[PDB]
Amino acid sequence: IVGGKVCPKGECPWQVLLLVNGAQLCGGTLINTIWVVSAAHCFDKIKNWRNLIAVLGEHDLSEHDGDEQSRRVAQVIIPSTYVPGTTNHDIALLRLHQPVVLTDHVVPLCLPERTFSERTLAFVRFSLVSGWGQLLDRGATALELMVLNVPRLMTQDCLQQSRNITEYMFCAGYSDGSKDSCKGDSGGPHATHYRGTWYLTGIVSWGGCATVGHFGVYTRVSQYIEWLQKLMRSEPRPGVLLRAPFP
Amino acid sequence: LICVNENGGCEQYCSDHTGTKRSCRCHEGYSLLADGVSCTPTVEYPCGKIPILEKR
Ligand SMILES: O=C(NCc1cccc(-n2ncc(-c3cc4cnccc4[nH]3)c2O)c1)[C@@H](O)CO
Numbered sequence: 007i008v009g010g011k012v013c014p015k016g017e018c019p020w021q022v023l024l025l026v027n028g029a030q031l032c033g034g035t036l037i038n039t040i041w042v043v044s045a046a047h048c049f050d051k052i053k054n055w056r057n058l059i060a061v062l063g064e065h066d067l068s069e070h071d072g073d074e075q076s077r078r079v080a081q082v083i084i085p086s087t088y089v090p091g092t093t094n095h096d097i098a099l100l101r102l103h104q105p106v107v108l109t110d111h112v113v114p115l116c117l118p119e120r121t122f123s124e125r126t127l128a129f130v131r132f133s134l135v136s137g138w139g140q141l142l143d144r145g146a147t148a149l150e151l152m153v154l155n156v157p158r159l160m161t162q163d164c165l166q167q168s169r170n171i172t173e174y175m176f177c178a179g180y181s182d183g184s185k186d187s188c189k190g191d192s193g194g195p196h197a198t199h200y201r202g203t204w205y206l207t208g209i210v211s212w213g214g215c216a217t218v219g220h221f222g223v224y225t226r227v228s229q230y231i232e233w234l235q236k237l238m239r240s241e242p243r244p245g246v247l248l249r250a251p252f253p
Numbered sequence: 254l255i256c257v258n259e260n261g262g263c264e265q266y267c268s269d270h271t272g273t274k275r276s277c278r279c280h281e282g283y284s285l286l287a288d289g290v291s292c293t294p295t296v297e298y299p300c301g302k303i304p305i306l307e308k309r
């Protein structure tokens with residue numbers, strides 16, 4: 007995250023850190039005790055699908071404080087329409103091997119109904135994006151979780167104000183090079199507040215970090231609500247990676 | 254009251270029905286109050302609320 011602030015510990019309790027062989031891979035968003043939403047492209051180069059870990063309740067990567075909860079990732083589900091190394095349909099649904107325990111530091115973000123998200127949440131101007139990604143373009147990643155308030159653009163306006171955005175994406179952020187999500191943040195939440203509750207509206211996608219003349223691009227979660235809900239009602243299948251028909 | 258305008262007055266989710274009829278609904282872990290619009294938590298850790306801020 008470029009140009010944000012530290013998310014005070016416990017104020018982003020849905021944020022997930024994904025690790026592969028102990029190394030930072032991507033962010034994610036907890037939506038229930040066993041389900042995490044992330045970005046498909048995070049998994050383009052995974053060799054050993056059995057060494058993927060999700061961490062909840064994380065804050066400062068330099069220390070252990072006892073609020074962290076780690077789980078093996080049992081399933082990574084990716085839409086059939088996603089093509090590796092591209093941006094469209096950049097979403098993944100992850101099943102944890104065992105539920106996390108909800109606590110003051112571990113709480114799911116609400117996955118909204120499609121109608122509500124399209125009719126109401128899509129018109130809330132500002133939303134929060136968070137992660138442990140790069141603090142600067144070509145810079146080091148963050149040790150404490152960072153958060154940034156970004157305004158959403160209608161796609162017509164994003165194209166005009168920009169010095170390929172599909173119906174499965176939206177733009178948000180700033181064109182002045184000061185504030186953006188960055189490498190290391192992909193998969194994390196774009197969270198929208200409405201009448202006292204926060205909802206998942208976007209996933210940090212890729213990929214140009216706080217580049218003048220350009221906005222951040224986010225996966226438009228509203229397009230995937232029904233796809234996600236059907237998969238969460240399904241039984242697990244052997245083998246970690248599952249490609250599931252979309253729509 | 255239509256769901257497209259002002260969320261139908263609903264705090265959370267809204268369904269249009271046959272006639273001048275609307276029903277609000279709440280996410281799992283919430284219940285709808287007798288006003289027909291407001292949602293109140295029914296569990297300790299409902300989705301989308303920040304415990305350290307709700308306690309403060
Ligand atoms: O192609 C690959 N796929 C894997 C893989 C995994 C995990 C992460 C990345 N990955 N690389 C770059 C970015 C990224 C840039 C960016 C700008 N603005 C907002 C969010 C942004 N994210 C990113 O998320 C790739 C490589 O691994 C090639 O080796």
Ligand SMILES: [Ca+2]
Nearest residue numbers: 065066069070
């Ligand atoms: Ca820690």
Ligand SMILES: [Cl-]
Nearest residue numbers: 077078103104
């Ligand atoms: Cl586990």
